[model samples]
Target: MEAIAKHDFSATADDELSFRKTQILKILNMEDDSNWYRAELDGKEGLIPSNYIEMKNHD
Candidate 1:
């Protein structure tokens, strides 16, 4: 889940997620075009970020 490790089961365990570019983009909601209401998802997991690390995001 932290980073891509194709040969290491430690990183790709069933309960752990793969950090493949496609996967992260999908998990963080960057891939989808769907727009959601902020209030409906307030305080919930996977909600949009209030403020983000501009550089980290751009990376």
Candidate 2:
């Protein structure tokens, strides 16, 4: 469950994200395929724009 931010995003709520650098976080859902993904950066947890992240290949 790893990802890299593809753009700058700022979240005003607790369930959002704020990042300038390409943040790598654990994608916290499996069943939902919406544009938003629940992610955690370090200890910060929130819903991030899926469009703002590119799914990275671990290979």
Candidate 3:
């Protein structure tokens, strides 16, 4: 197997990432969800569909 392009990711809010909502959300979902259709990701937690939080907080 060959390697793909390398990527460096950070989950913190710094001066350069003040408004990067897409990157943050993407990593959050990937780190927790991992393609589980009925699963939900919230701050490192995985939950079932019936107990998932459809709405999210924005500020």
Candidate 4:
């Protein structure tokens, strides 16, 4: 799956992913918790705040 950042988010931890608003990200993994998701951006993979991104729908 894919998503686009809705807001800029700075990573507070090493495991988290940081991204600017309107950036495209690939959804890699979704854990039990809905707050954080594993995603890839610019070839880097890390957990990102789910609330900061909106899912990109495919038809």
Candidate No. with top lDDT = 4
lDDT of 4 by residue, 1-59 (tens): 87777788988779889988888888878977588888887778889888898888232
Model 3 bad stretches (over 4 Å): 1-27, 30-44
Per-candidate local distance difference test: 0.23, 0.71, 0.24, 0.82
lDDT of 4 at 58: 32
Task: Report the C-alpha displacement of residue 17, candidate 4, in angstroms.
Answer: 0.6
lDDT agreement of model 1 with the native: 0.23
How do the residues 1-59 of candidate 1 rate in per-residue lDDT, one tens digit apiece? 11111221112233222222312222243334243112111133242222221112221
- Could you tell me which 10 consecutive residues in candidate 3 have the lowest summed lDDT? 15-24
Q: Show where candidate 4 strays beyond 4 Å.
A: 57-59
| TM-score per candidate, chains pooled | 0.18, 0.72, 0.16, 0.83
Point out the higher-scoring one by TM-score: 3 or 4: 4
Per-residue lDDT over 1-59 for candidate 2, one digit per residue giving the tens place of the 0 to 100 score:
77777588887567777776565667776347487777776786788777777778242
In the predicted model 1, the residue pairs found to clash are none
The predictions' CA RMSDs to the true structure, in order, are: 12.7, 2.6, 14.2, 2.2
TM-score of the candidate numbered 1?
Answer: 0.18
**Local error of candidate 1 at residue 23 (angstroms):** 6.2
Report the Cα lDDT for candidate 3: 0.24
